[PDB]
Amino acid sequence: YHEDIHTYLREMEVKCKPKVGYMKKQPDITNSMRAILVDWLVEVGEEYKLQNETLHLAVNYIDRFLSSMSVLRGKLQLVGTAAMLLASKFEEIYPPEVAEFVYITTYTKKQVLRMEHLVLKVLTFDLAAPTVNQFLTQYFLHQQPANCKVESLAMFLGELSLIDADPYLKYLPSVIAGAAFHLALYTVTGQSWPESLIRKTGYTLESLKPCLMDLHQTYLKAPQHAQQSIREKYKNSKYHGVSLLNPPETLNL
Amino acid sequence: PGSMENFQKVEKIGEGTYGVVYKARNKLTGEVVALKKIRLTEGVPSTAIREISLLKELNHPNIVKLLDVIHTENKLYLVFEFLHQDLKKFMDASALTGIPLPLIKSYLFQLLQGLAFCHSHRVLHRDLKPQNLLINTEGAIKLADFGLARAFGVPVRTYTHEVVTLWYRAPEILLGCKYYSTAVDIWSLGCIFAEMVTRRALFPGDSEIDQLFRIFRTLGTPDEVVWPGVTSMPDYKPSFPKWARQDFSKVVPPLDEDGRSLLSQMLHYDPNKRISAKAALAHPFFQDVTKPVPHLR
Numbered sequence: 001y002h003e004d005i006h007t008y009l010r011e012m013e014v015k016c017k018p019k020v021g022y023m024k025k026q027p028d029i030t031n032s033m034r035a036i037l038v039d040w041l042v043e044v045g046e047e048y049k050l051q052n053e054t055l056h057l058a059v060n061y062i063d064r065f066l067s068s069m070s071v072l073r074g075k076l077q078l079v080g081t082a083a084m085l086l087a088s089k090f091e092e093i094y095p096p097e098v099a100e101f102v103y104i105t106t107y108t109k110k111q112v113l114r115m116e117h118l119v120l121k122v123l124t125f126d127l128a129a130p131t132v133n134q135f136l137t138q139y140f141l142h143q144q145p146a147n148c149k150v151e152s153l154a155m156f157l158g159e160l161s162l163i164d165a166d167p168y169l170k171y172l173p174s175v176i177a178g179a180a181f182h183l184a185l186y187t188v189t190g191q192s193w194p195e196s197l198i199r200k201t202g203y204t205l206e207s208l209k210p211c212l213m214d215l216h217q218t219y220l221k222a223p224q225h226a227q228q229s230i231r232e233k234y235k236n237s238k239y240h241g242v243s244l245l246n247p248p249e250t251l252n253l
Numbered sequence: 254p255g256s257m258e259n260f261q262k263v264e265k266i267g268e269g270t271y272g273v274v275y276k277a278r279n280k281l282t283g284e285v286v287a288l289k290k291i292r293l294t295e296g297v298p299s300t301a302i303r304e305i306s307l308l309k310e311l312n313h314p315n316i317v318k319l320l321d322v323i324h325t326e327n328k329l330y331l332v333f334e335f336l337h338q339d340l341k342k343f344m345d346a347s348a349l350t351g352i353p354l355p356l357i358k359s360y361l362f363q364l365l366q367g368l369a370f371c372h373s374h375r376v377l378h379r380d381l382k383p384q385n386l387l388i389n390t391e392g393a394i395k396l397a398d399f400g401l402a403r404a405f406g407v408p409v410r411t412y413t414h415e416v417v418t419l420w421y422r423a424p425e426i427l428l429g430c431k432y433y434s435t436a437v438d439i440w441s442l443g444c445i446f447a448e449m450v451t452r453r454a455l456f457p458g459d460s461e462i463d464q465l466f467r468i469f470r471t472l473g474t475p476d477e478v479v480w481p482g483v484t485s486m487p488d489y490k491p492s493f494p495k496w497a498r499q500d501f502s503k504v505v506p507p508l509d510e511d512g513r514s515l516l517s518q519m520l521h522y523d524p525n526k527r528i529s530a531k532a533a534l535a536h537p538f539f540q541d542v543t544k545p546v547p548h549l550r
């Protein structure tokens with residue numbers, strides 16, 4: 001089903017894409033407050049040992065909710081909590097309980113649950129969104145042979161992109177996933193976006209280039225960024241401590 | 254688009270994975286529907302979240318159609334198309350007649366269409382059994398009750414273990430494999446195919462070892478030849494009695510050569526060799542298939 005699924009996901013990711021502009025339309029919140037929120041979500045995920053997919057889904061929910069609902073900064077975290085709650089309920093075998101979410105934030109349980117229902121309405125229950133993670137995982141099957149550091153490094157960079165609305169809102173999951181995959185495989189092995197993935201996706205280094213330049217910057221600037229939960233997280237053995245590897249200085253594109 | 258005010262509740266139907274289903278009619282359009290009523294503290298149950306969001310994506314003539322979600326703060330209502338009865342209740346009624354081959358054929362074919370569509374859209378059903386396969390008076394059968402379903406990834410990762418009603422549960426779940434896939438839904442269908450023919454459950458076990466042993470006594474105990482990796486699976490025991498495989502013509506005696514060929518592919522031990530729903534559609538069993546109306550009700 002590998003090609004049918006990939007085709008289906010390529011269609012959904014367009015329909016499931018947040019409004020690129022949205023932050024300019026928000027009176028009270030900024031790209032940088034969203035970054036704080038996402039960085040916090042990363043901590044929640046590590047604390048509760050949540051799947052990386054779960055985190056990715058939450059961010060998709062928050063961006064979509066924020067594409068059409070105007071929110072005050074005192075509530076941004078409420079939205080994020082409910083989003084993470086819904087993502088856990090969708091994705092995890094064992095979601096944390098409502099109580100655990102109330103505790104990590106204060107807002108009441110009643111607030112969290114009311115927000116949850118609001119988010120469902122606003123998203124009209126469309127929760128099965130494609131993510132950078134779902135794409136990468138497919139791309140990984142084209143490694144010859146599989147290399148664990150490449151996978152973890154790709155996941156790391158993919159994750160890094162969640163944090164910065166500008167620029168990453170402008171790129172689709174399948175594109176970020178491609179930049180991430182190439183960037184990771186290059187950093188670790190010197191190899192390139194492979195032929196077989198050109199056949200699968202239709203993307204080339206040329207089409208990937210724009211995102212790739214942004215990613216390569218994000219990478220080089222990563223030790224300096226105000227947000228660090230992802231770098232911290234990816235020091236773990238579980239992800240092969242890839243966040244300690246050195247970014248290449250140039251890409252040769 | 255809906256409002257509870259336009260539905261007249263008509264009778265309770267039953268209790269599936271969660272919540273409750275009633276037959277009801279829309280006062281303004283005339284349409285008969287099934288309402289699933291969900292009492293809403295964990296907030297919205299993961300089952301409803303999954304069912305709703307996946308059913309929204311799956312619009313197919315052999316998947317039950319979610320028409321609407323009426324979303325109060327107290328209660329959540331799912332409006333579904335109405336179907337007249339389920340496959341189990343139909344098999345019981347055919348008790349004396351038997352189900353005629355062209356109906357078995359049509360239903361299996363249709364079931365494989367609906368499954369193929371789910372798998373194609375990265376959805377696992379994980380609870381195929383006669384009670385969740387609904388029939389109408391026009392010859393349609395449809396996959397319902399998606400409360401246990403889930404969105405998978407490629408390749409899959411570890412998902413919930415406690416899965417699929419026992420009688421319909423594939424060997425790889427029984428043997429605790431950390432990866433299971435689309436093949437689990439096929440196993441269930443294979444079982445149901447057997448069931449539609451004999452009118453009795455193929456592997457009616459009462460516990461997980463009883464289930465394995467019933468499976469083992471029909472298909473023979475699997476080894477590394479038939480299924481590489483078995484002897485390494487977490488719940489595999491070297492002490493398992495080792496039964497000879499039975500000739501398929503005895504498993505489901507009324508089945509012809511094509512039928513049998515199909516069931517055996519649907520019941521292969523190794524998930525990787527088990528036929529896909531997609532592939533199963535082109536099987537010579539279906540070459541003369543039609544879509545007769547159900548000979549009863």
Ligand SMILES: NC(=O)c1ccc(Nc2nc(N)c(N=O)c(OCC3CCCCC3)n2)cc1
Pocket residue numbers: 266267268269270274287317333334335336337338339342384385387397398
């Ligand atoms: N034998 C029976 O009495 C009969 C009459 C009617 C019937 N109709 C219908 N239609 C639906 N669309 C639907 N779910 O979506 C559903 O769920 C019914 C539930 C019952 C509990 C297990 C899961 C299925 N039922 C079904 C059965």
